[PDB]
Amino acid sequence: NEEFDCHFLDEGFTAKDILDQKINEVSSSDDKDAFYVADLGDILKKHLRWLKALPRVTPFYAVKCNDSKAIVKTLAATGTGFDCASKTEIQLVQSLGVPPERIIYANPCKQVSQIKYAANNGVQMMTFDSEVELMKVARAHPKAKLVLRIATDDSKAVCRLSVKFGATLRTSRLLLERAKELNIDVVGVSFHVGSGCTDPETFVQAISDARCVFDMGAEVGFSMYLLDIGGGFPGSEDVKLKFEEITGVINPALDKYFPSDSGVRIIAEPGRYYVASAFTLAVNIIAKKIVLKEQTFMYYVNDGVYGSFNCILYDHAHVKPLLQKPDEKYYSSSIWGPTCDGLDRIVERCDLPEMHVGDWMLFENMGAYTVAAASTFNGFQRPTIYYVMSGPAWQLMQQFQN
Amino acid sequence: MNNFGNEEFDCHFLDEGFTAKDILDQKINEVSSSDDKDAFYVADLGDILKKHLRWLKALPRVTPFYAVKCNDSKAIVKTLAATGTGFDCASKTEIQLVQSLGVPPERIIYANPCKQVSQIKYAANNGVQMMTFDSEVELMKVARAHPKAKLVLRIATDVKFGATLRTSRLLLERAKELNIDVVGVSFHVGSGCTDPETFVQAISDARCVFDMGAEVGFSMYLLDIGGGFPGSEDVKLKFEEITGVINPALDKYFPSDSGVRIIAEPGRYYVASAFTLAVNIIAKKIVLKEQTFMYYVNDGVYGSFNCILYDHAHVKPLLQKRPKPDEKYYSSSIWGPTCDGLDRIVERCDLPEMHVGDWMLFENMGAYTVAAASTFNGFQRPTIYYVMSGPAWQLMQQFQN
C-alpha cells in the first residue's frame, strides 16, 4: 500500500529533483496520471521552525488539513499533539499509537454519539461555545475538561453578520456560570484567528480577550490553565504575512497576558503550517485547443476542482501553474480540469508558452486542504502520493522520538 | 429499517400505500429513543422507473443514455440497465462500473470530448467504440489510441466544450484526412438553460453539421441531444414544456424516414426526485438581535450540500410535520458539521424553534449530491436506504422482458 510506502531522498536531491526524475522516467509511455511528491522532511523542518519561533506553545496538528497516515505518523513520532474534530479523526490518530492526552477534540458543536465516542476512548479535553453544548456534555461526557472557544473578528470575512464559532465575552461569562451550575470543569480558553489573517495584531486582541475570560473563570471558581491560540499560520513563504512576523507579535502578547510563572500551558492548532509546502502536485496536459482571438490556448489537465483544486472553491486558493527560454513567446491560456462540467476550470487566464499534450504542469504548496477534500466525481481517481524522506530527516525524527 | 450487509445492493420492500416519506418517518421513529441519529437518505428506485415511463411518453423517438456522473450508485445503474437505458460514461471508472453490471459496450457512449490517452485506450480495450470530440488534438489522439472509433462531433450551444460550426467543418475535413469515422453530432444545452428555443437552435446547428459531414463523404446517423432536463417539478421550466419544443424540431430537422438514431444524455432527470435526505440537528445556538437560531446538522457543504458550490443548488429545509399556522417562526441559519466557517447550508430561513435530535428533510437530493461528496474532517457519507415497491419491481420486469 502506497500510504505506508516511503522512498529515500538521496543527499543533495530535493523534492523538485525527485519530481523531475519521475517525469523523465514515464516520458515514452501513456502512464501519465497526476501525482504528488510529499517530502516528510519538510514537515520536520516546519517542526524545528515552530520550536524556534514559538518555544512556549505546544503544537496540536489540525488533522482535517491533511489526514495522510504518513503525515500523522511523522508528526506523532515528532511528539506533536493532534486536534481532532470527529470520531474518524480520533480513530486515525489512536490507530497510530497516540494516547488520548495528546488529543484535543476542538470541535465546538459535536454530535452526541461522537462526544460519547470520545468519552469511551479517554479523550477528555473538548472545546465548546454554547449552552446547548454544555447540556450535551453534562449528559454524554460529564467528566470532560472543557475549553471555551471565544470569538475573533475577521474584518475581511465574506459573511461578517453570522460567525459559525466563538462566544463573545458577554456570552463567555454566562457560559462559565452555567458550566459551574452543571458541575462541568472548564480548564481554559481557545480562539482561532482564521487562515485569512492580514494583521498579526488580531492575535494580540484574541490573547487579551482570552486573558479576560481567564479572569472570569477565576471569578466563577475555575482553575484555568489551558490557553489554545488556534491555527491559521501560513504554510509557505509565498504569502505577504510570513510565519515569523506573526510569531514575533504573538510572543510579547503571551509574555504580557500569560506569563510562564502563572502555570499556564499554551497550545496551538496549526494545520496548513505543517504541510502546505511539503506537497507538490504534477498534472499532465491531457487535451488542448487553440482559439484564434491573437493565438490563445485551452489546456485540459487530469486533476481539477472536484479533485485537488477543490481548494479554489472551499479554501480561497489562488493557484500558480509552474513549468516542469526567455525569448520564447507566451500566450494567453486557460487551464481546465478533466470532468465533463463547464465549471471545472482551474485557471481563467494566465501566460504560458505553447504546451503540448503529455507535458506536465507543477503546482507547489499543495499539501493543505487539497487531497483532504477531493472527491472522485465523474470517476476520476485521486492522484497517487509518493512520500519521500532523506536519511538525515529520518535521523532528526529519531532524535525527536528520544 | 436497517441495511443487510452493504447498502449498495440491499433493497427494501415499499409496502402497498406507503411512500418514501412514510419510510423516512418510520426510520426516524425507530431511532427516536437513542443517539444513533446519523444523516441518511431514502432512495425510491420506483421513482426512477416512473421517470423512465415519463421519458418514453414524452420523447418516444429518443433513446436515453443515463449520465452516470450525476449519481454513480450501483443500485441506480442496475435499475436503469435492467430498464434498458444506455449509459453516458466519461472515464475508465464509469465504464468499469457499467460493464461490471453486465451492460454491453454498444449501450455505452463515451461522451467526454477531452479524454486522457490511457482512458481512450481503456475504452478501445473494452469494445467501447462511440466517443465524442470537439478538437483537432482529440482527432490526433484517437488516430493513435482508438483508430476504429465512431466519433460524435460535439457542437457549441448558446465555454469548455463544443465546436463552433466553422470549427466543425475543419474537424470533419481533418477526420477524413486521418481516416477516422464521424457518425454523428452531439450537443448539451446545460442545466442552467431557461429557454427551450436553445434546443431548436442546437438541433438546427446539428442538421448543418450533418450536412457538412455528407459533403465530405460521411454517413451521419447519430443525433445526441444531451442533457439538462429538470429532475423535479420544483422548477419554472418543466420537462414536458421542453419536450414539447424538442419534438417538433426533431421532426422538422431529423425526420424518422432519414434513418437517424436520436439519443440523449439525461442525468438529473432520472434521479433528482428519487432521493430524500434526512439530517439531524446536532447543535444549536440562540442569538438575540429579536430571537434568532443557528442550527448545526450532520451533513454539509463538503458532503451532500457540495451542490451549493458546484451545482448552483438552492436547498429548502422541510420539517417532518408541517407546522400549525399559529406556531411562531424565527429567523434561522443552518450549518454543516465541519470545523470550517464556510460550511453553511442556509443563510436565512424561517423555522419554528427546533431542538437537538430533531430532523430536517431535503427533497430532490439525488443529483450532483452524493456523487461529489467527500469525507473532509472525517464526517462519513450518509447511509442510503434503497426502497422499491412490488408494483415498481413488476414494471421493471415488463421493461427488462
Ligand SMILES: *Cc1c(COP(=O)(O)O)cnc(C)c1O
Ligand atoms: C481547521 C482548524 C484549524 C487549522 O487551521 P489552519 O488554517 O490549517 O492552521 C485550527 N483550529 C481549528 C479549531 C480548526 O477548525
Ligand SMILES: *Cc1c(COP(=O)(O)O)cnc(C)c1O
Ligand atoms: C453531465 C452531462 C450530462 C448530464 O447532465 P444533466 O444536467 O444531469 O442532465 C449530459 N451530457 C453531458 C455531455 C454531460 O457532461
